[PDB]
Design a protein around this nucleic acid. Structure first.
Lengths: 653, 73
RNA sequence: UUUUUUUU
């Protein structure tokens, strides 16, 4: 049964020692392999012991993936034999499924539990927080263990627990001042690790070679999962495989190619989960989505070239850069573990044992040193952290990364010149968006030159969170069929959602215009939540006055939407110069940036011949192969720059 | 017995040196009623470049090729 | 000449 199968799991035999270990200490670190059962079985044992007991307090289990938080809570509903939503819950960003008094253990995600600090700092509702998957090192996780180090003096009865990978768990104990490390070494179906004896020249070819080495000779049924870097090296490997599959003879069995990555549409991502029939072999190409996110059944053979793709925010010019790097030893061992999911599996690594020891690194990158810190400084400052350099964090942000986030809150008006969080800055903690985006909504209501247009700025801001995964295929093919007069990449988003709305939210409308229907469901959910929080602050009430008291429904709408996005994004404006567009900052000089091939400003500058507008607002300055610009917005009038942000542009113009 | 006359007020009417011998802005936070806007005057005193340094100083500051292996000389 | 995963 299920009660018989719980004894089969590795953490169950260590339980009787483990309870006395938690009751004696306060912070305990569990060093376990994947599949040990430390996620599922551990908070169950506290309920069986009566941990929560009579008390109001309930257990929280923190996981980085939203998809994994729902899926694990279904399993605990099966094992404890209670229906989901009562006695076993999950609270994620959109689907709260909890009972406020009858649900004991809630499997929320990592971004949720930081938001509960914002109201209630001491966490009065919880007795035992278990961080899970702490080796992921998401941005929400590093602040959460940074803040829970300060809360342990204020509460001696709170228990903290951490599940971690093996190589990362040593560094946690020193952070909590040498709290004990417990060990559960549970591993299923070990994998034999094969190497190349000499370094290769072009790894894409050797990947194609090694698939045929598995295909033509090895035992069946066997599937192959390869780990390419990104989208572009999957299609090149998808095309080169389709030639050689046809050119080979009719005797060999059929090979199926099914690419997976995040931005590929939902209709094709369901094709891996279909069981392949007899007399044919399934080969799956994938990015990082295969190793941690989801489970493909039948994967015996895993080919691993050893490359990941990572983004480093360069905080001086304020640009992300996305390059290919050699992955660390931690992520390689996670890639080999996907082989032994069902039975014993091979793992082929296209590199040598000398290079694997001496060239690769142990820990990849802490994500707080990479990404932008403009959102969390406002989270820290509202929790009364006066000193940020001396803040007891695990991996410090660099000082230019932390300097640029303090100027950027001062421009927006969140921080007063004495350092105090202002009235506007308290709202930006409340909204579920960035500090830049929540000022766009604020000048969409109150600011005297931009009033009344908040009903449209909620539409665009909702669309900008989902701009990768909107369009099936190329943008301009789907952009031209919708309408043909757009001159900026933002007003297309207002128009696609408005015509999807007047079609009463059809599934069949999206497949007409090559738009992912699953994405437009997620844009609608983001729009409704931003609309609640704008009621609760009171922006909706001051919005509706400025449309009735001042009637404006002409073509002045798209000139007020442009002036809201200057007050929100004032550092992101470029200027047309001799080489091209150059960044207009006072600290960062011109970087000679070029419009991305997706954007509407790229069609109008090459396929037509519109004369380029002298200023362009962008949303994201990223460099894959060249310093690019995405999600552009034409600013026609130069005097909108001085009038909206005079604290920067009264000088530079 | 002499010649005498009265002259009253009503009748008529570079750095000095003694001897010859041989700046930064700092902002600290308040530690534990609201301000509507930053205002034009405030930016004039503390410029936007200056706020990033001064807040820290108050706290105590003072391409890989297209295809290769991991080796592949 | 074309975005790695994610979270509120």
């Amino acid at each position: 049964t299920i009660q018989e199968a719980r004894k089969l799991l590795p953490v169950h035999q260590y339980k009787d020692e483990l309870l006395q270990e938690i009751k004696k200490n306060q912070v305990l670190i569990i060093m376990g392999e994947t599949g040990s059962g430390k996620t599922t079985q551990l908070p169950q044992y506290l309920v069986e012991d009566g941990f929560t007991d009579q008390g109001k307090l309930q257990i929280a289990i923190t996981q980085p993936r939203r998809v994994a938080a729902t899926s694990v809570a279904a399993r605990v509903a099966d094992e404890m034999n209670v229906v989901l939503g009562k006695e076993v819950g999950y609270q994620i960003r959109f689907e709260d499924k909890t009972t406020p008094n009858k649900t004991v253990l809630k499997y929320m995600t990592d971004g949720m539990l930081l938001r509960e600090f914002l109201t209630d700092s001491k966490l009065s509702k919880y007795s035992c927080i278990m961080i899970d998957e702490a080796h992921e090192r998401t941005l929400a996780t590093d602040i959460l263990i940074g803040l829970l180090k300060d809360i342990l003096p204020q509460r001696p009865t709170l228990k903290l627990l951490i599940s971690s990978a093996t190589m990362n768990a040593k560094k946690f104990s020193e952070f909590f001042d040498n709290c004990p490390i417990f060990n559960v070494p549970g591993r299923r179906y070990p994998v034999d690790i094969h190497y190349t004896l000499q370094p290769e020249a072009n790894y894409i070819h050797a990947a194609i070679t090694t698939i045929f080495q598995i295909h033509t000779t090895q035992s069946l049924p066997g599937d192959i999962l390869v780990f390419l870097t990104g989208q572009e090296e999957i299609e090149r490997t998808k095309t080169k495989l389709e030639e050689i599959m046809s050119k080979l003879g009719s005797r060999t069995k059929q090979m199926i190619i099914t690419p997976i990555y995040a931005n590929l549409p939902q209709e094709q991502q369901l094709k891996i989960f279909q069981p392949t029939p007899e007399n044919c072999r399934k080969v799956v190409l994938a990015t990082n989505i295969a190793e941690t996110s989801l489970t493909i059944d039948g994967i015996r053979y895993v080919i691993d070239p050893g490359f990941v793709k990572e983004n480093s925010y360069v905080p001086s010019t304020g640009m992300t850069q996305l390059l290919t790097v050699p992955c660390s030893r931690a992520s390689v061992d996670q890639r080999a573990g996907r082989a032994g999911r069902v039975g014993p599996g091979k793992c082929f690594r296209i590199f040598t044992k000398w290079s694997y020891l001496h060239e690769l690194e142990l820990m990849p990158k802490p994500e707080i040193t990479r990404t932008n810190l403009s959102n969390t400084v406002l989270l820290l400052l509202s929790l009364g952290v006066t000193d940020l350099i001396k803040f007891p964090l695990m991996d410090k942000p660099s000082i230019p990364t932390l300097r640029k986030s303090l100027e950027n809150l001062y421009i927006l008006g969140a921080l007063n010149s004495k350092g105090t969080i202002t009235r506007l800055g308290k709202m930006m903690c409340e909204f579920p968006c960035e500090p830049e985006f929540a000022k766009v909504l604020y000048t969409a209501a109150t600011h005297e030159q931009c009033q009344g247009v908040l009903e449209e700025c909620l539409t665009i801001v909702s669309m900008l969170h989902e701009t990768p995964s909107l369009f099936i295929g190329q943008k301009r093919d789907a952009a031209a069929s919708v309408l043909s007069e757009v001159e900026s990449d933002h007003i297309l988003y207002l128009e696609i959602f408005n015509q999807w709305r007047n079609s009463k939210f059809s599934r069949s409308w999206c497949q007409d215009h090559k738009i992912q229907f699953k994405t437009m469901l997620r844009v609608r959910n983001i729009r409704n939540q931003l609309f609640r929080c704008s009621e609760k602050v009171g922006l909706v009430e001051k919005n509706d006055q400025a449309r009735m008291k001042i009637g404006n429904i002409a073509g002045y709408i798209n000139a007020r939407i442009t002036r809201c996005f200057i007050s929100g994004f004032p550092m992101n404006i470029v200027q047309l110069g001799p080489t091209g567009y150059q960044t207009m900052g006072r600290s960062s000089g011109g970087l000679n940036v070029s419009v991305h091939p997706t954007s509407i400003l790229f069609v109008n500058h090459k396929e037509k011949a519109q004369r380029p507008s002298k200023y362009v607002l962008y949303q994201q300055l990223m460099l894959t192969s060249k310093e690019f610009i995405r999600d552009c917005l034409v600013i026609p009038k130069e005097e909108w720059l001085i009038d909206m942000v005079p604290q920067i542009f009264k000088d530079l113009i | 017995s002499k010649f005498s006359l009265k002259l009253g007020s009503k009748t008529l009417k570079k750095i000095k040196i003694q001897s010859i011998d041989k700046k930064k802005l700092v902002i600290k936070l308040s530690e534990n009623p609201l301000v509507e806007y930053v205002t034009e005057k405030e930016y004039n005193e503390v410029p936007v470049e200056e706020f990033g340094d001064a807040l820290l100083r108050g706290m105590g500051w003072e391409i890989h090729p297209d295809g290769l292996g991991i080796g592949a000389k």
